[PDB]
Design an enzyme around this catalytic site. Structure first.
Site, PDB file in Angstrom:
ATOM      1  N   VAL A   1       9.201 -13.758  -0.679  1.00  0.00           N
ATOM      2  CA  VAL A   1       8.716 -12.387  -0.827  1.00  0.00           C
ATOM      3  C   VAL A   1       8.661 -11.963  -2.294  1.00  0.00           C
ATOM      4  O   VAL A   1       7.657 -11.405  -2.750  1.00  0.00           O
ATOM      5  CB  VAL A   1       9.507 -11.384   0.067  1.00  0.00           C
ATOM      6  CG1 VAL A   1       9.145  -9.949  -0.282  1.00  0.00           C
ATOM      7  CG2 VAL A   1       9.229 -11.654   1.550  1.00  0.00           C
ATOM      8  N   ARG A   2       9.727 -12.245  -3.040  1.00  0.00           N
ATOM      9  CA  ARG A   2       9.766 -11.843  -4.443  1.00  0.00           C
ATOM     10  C   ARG A   2       8.988 -12.784  -5.350  1.00  0.00           C
ATOM     11  O   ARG A   2       8.024 -12.360  -5.982  1.00  0.00           O
ATOM     12  CB  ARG A   2      11.204 -11.624  -4.954  1.00  0.00           C
ATOM     13  CG  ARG A   2      11.887 -10.310  -4.505  1.00  0.00           C
ATOM     14  CD  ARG A   2      10.988  -9.064  -4.582  1.00  0.00           C
ATOM     15  NE  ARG A   2      10.282  -8.950  -5.858  1.00  0.00           N
ATOM     16  CZ  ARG A   2       9.631  -7.869  -6.284  1.00  0.00           C
ATOM     17  NH1 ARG A   2       9.641  -6.754  -5.568  1.00  0.00           N
ATOM     18  NH2 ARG A   2       9.003  -7.901  -7.451  1.00  0.00           N
TER      19      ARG A   2
ATOM     20  N   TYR B   1      16.917  -8.195  -8.456  1.00  0.00           N
ATOM     21  CA  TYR B   1      16.771  -9.580  -8.930  1.00  0.00           C
ATOM     22  C   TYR B   1      18.111 -10.165  -9.342  1.00  0.00           C
ATOM     23  O   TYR B   1      18.374 -11.344  -9.122  1.00  0.00           O
ATOM     24  CB  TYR B   1      15.752  -9.709 -10.075  1.00  0.00           C
ATOM     25  CG  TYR B   1      14.344  -9.906  -9.573  1.00  0.00           C
ATOM     26  CD1 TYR B   1      13.856 -11.185  -9.279  1.00  0.00           C
ATOM     27  CD2 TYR B   1      13.502  -8.813  -9.372  1.00  0.00           C
ATOM     28  CE1 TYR B   1      12.571 -11.361  -8.805  1.00  0.00           C
ATOM     29  CE2 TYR B   1      12.213  -8.981  -8.913  1.00  0.00           C
ATOM     30  CZ  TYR B   1      11.751 -10.253  -8.620  1.00  0.00           C
ATOM     31  OH  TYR B   1      10.473 -10.418  -8.143  1.00  0.00           O
TER      32      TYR B   1
ATOM     33  N   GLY C   1       5.303 -13.538  -4.516  1.00  0.00           N
ATOM     34  CA  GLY C   1       4.650 -12.279  -4.851  1.00  0.00           C
ATOM     35  C   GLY C   1       4.403 -12.124  -6.339  1.00  0.00           C
ATOM     36  O   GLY C   1       3.296 -11.780  -6.755  1.00  0.00           O
ATOM     37  N   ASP C   2       5.432 -12.394  -7.141  1.00  0.00           N
ATOM     38  CA  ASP C   2       5.327 -12.287  -8.589  1.00  0.00           C
ATOM     39  C   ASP C   2       4.269 -13.248  -9.126  1.00  0.00           C
ATOM     40  O   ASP C   2       3.484 -12.880  -9.990  1.00  0.00           O
ATOM     41  CB  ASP C   2       6.664 -12.606  -9.256  1.00  0.00           C
ATOM     42  CG  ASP C   2       7.764 -11.611  -8.916  1.00  0.00           C
ATOM     43  OD1 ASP C   2       8.928 -12.023  -9.060  1.00  0.00           O
ATOM     44  OD2 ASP C   2       7.488 -10.452  -8.530  1.00  0.00           O
TER      45      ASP C   2
ATOM     46  N   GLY D   1       1.254 -11.038 -10.166  1.00  0.00           N
ATOM     47  CA  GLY D   1       1.830 -10.637 -11.452  1.00  0.00           C
ATOM     48  C   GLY D   1       0.812 -10.311 -12.517  1.00  0.00           C
ATOM     49  O   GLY D   1       0.975  -9.329 -13.244  1.00  0.00           O
TER      50      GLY D   1
ATOM     51  N   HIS E   1       0.784  -1.234   0.000  1.00  0.00           N
ATOM     52  CA  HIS E   1       0.000   0.000   0.000  1.00  0.00           C
ATOM     53  C   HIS E   1       0.820   1.292   0.000  1.00  0.00           C
ATOM     54  O   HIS E   1       0.284   2.373   0.259  1.00  0.00           O
ATOM     55  CB  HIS E   1      -0.982  -0.013   1.168  1.00  0.00           C
ATOM     56  CG  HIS E   1      -2.026  -1.077   1.062  1.00  0.00           C
ATOM     57  ND1 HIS E   1      -2.638  -1.628   2.166  1.00  0.00           N
ATOM     58  CD2 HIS E   1      -2.560  -1.700  -0.017  1.00  0.00           C
ATOM     59  CE1 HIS E   1      -3.515  -2.535   1.773  1.00  0.00           C
ATOM     60  NE2 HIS E   1      -3.490  -2.594   0.454  1.00  0.00           N
TER      61      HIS E   1
END
EC number: 1.14.14.18
Lengths: 209, 207
Positions: free
Chosen positions: A125-126, A47, A129-130, A134, A19
């Site tokens: 987390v990455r 990345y 999340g993606d 995505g 947010h």
């Protein structure tokens, strides 16, 4: 189950990162393709660092099934940036924002310590999340900013037939990781830190807009 | 179809833009040729940007039949400005208002990203406006303020003979324009933004 504990333990930092003013404005159509491109440039930097750390941990024989190389984003992201920017200029132009420097520095520490539990936290987390959001983000980039879908390769996972099944399988792999209490606590702590790093990336991107 | 959804989707922003105090005052005779000239100066700045975006999108092969070069206004408008201002002085004098800076930025972003669907949205808002409300504006600048129709070339489209037919054909082209769901959503989004940009131009002209 680790998957449930991760989702619960990280809830606060996750909400705050997701947010952020930058992301909120981006997803509402209040920014532009330039800001999306800046985001992807900073992401390519982190990345790249993340995937060095993943490579080291995988090579060590830790969490191998979770660390699926089909998840690698850096090369796909470079191709997206080639299209967004229109040349390879970006490689020599871009540099890490202060938050990205801190994030990369942590990832490099994890790489050099071959810290498997901490790496898994960052991976969750990455990549989860993606995998999870995505399609939403990609849809917003097309809807608001007319981004070429061929320049949204980052959000598409070529080696994965069905995202729902993959995410379920990912969470089960988390559950089945053999971790001591010390390792599990280390991982949980790191996952909150990872969300915080990402929040700060967004804060940098949003400064002065 | 798209023409109907476009009108419906943009209705609120359109009504707000059309009923701006500046444009309302101008059209009913409360202002003057000076204010009309200020408007047209800002318009020359954004039409210049618009037509660069149109040129890029047309060249790329998108919406060719919609992007009729007969619609080009920038050159005609510059001639109107020469007449209104009495010389070419305006070129070095005029500067974009804050709202026009934002509008021009968007148009340049569309050009740079060769964003066809966005371009069509902006094309619709300006040119279909010119072919409808613009005709009323031209009549009233002459009637209220005595502007010579020689300085109203902007509102005359050469090679366009019948406006009703032209507008009906434009809307049919919209209906037949092939778009992905995402492109269509983007076109609609942008069309509302285009009305808002124009509303803001009017607001700055009132200041």
């Amino acid at each position: 189950g680790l998957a449930v504990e991760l989702k619960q333990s990280t809830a606060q930092a996750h909400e705050k990162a997701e947010h952020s003013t930058f992301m909120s404005d981006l997803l509402k159509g209040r920014l532009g393709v330039a800001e999306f491109t800046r985001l992807q440039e900073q992401a390519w930097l982190f990345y790249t660092a993340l995937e060095q750390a993943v490579d080291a941990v995988r090579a060590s024989g830790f969490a191998e099934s979770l660390l699926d190389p089909a998840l690698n984003r850096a090369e796909v992201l470079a191709r997206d940036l080639d299209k967004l920017n229109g040349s390879s200029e970006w490689r020599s132009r871009i540099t890490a924002s202060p938050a990205v420097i801190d994030y990369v520095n942590r990832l490099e520490e994890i790489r050099d310590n071959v810290d498997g539990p901490a790496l898994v936290a960052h991976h969750y987390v990455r990549y989860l999340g993606d995998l999870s959001g995505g399609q939403v983000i990609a849809r917003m980039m097309q809807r608001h900013y007319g981004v070429d879908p061929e320049a949204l390769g980052f959000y598409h996972f070529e080696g994965i037939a069905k995202l729902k099944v993959y995410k379920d399988e990912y969470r089960e792999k988390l559950n089945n990781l053999e971790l001591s209490d010390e390792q599990r606590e280390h991982l949980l702590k790191e996952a909150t830190d990872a969300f915080v790093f990402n929040h700060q990336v967004f804060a940098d991107l949003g400064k002065g807009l």
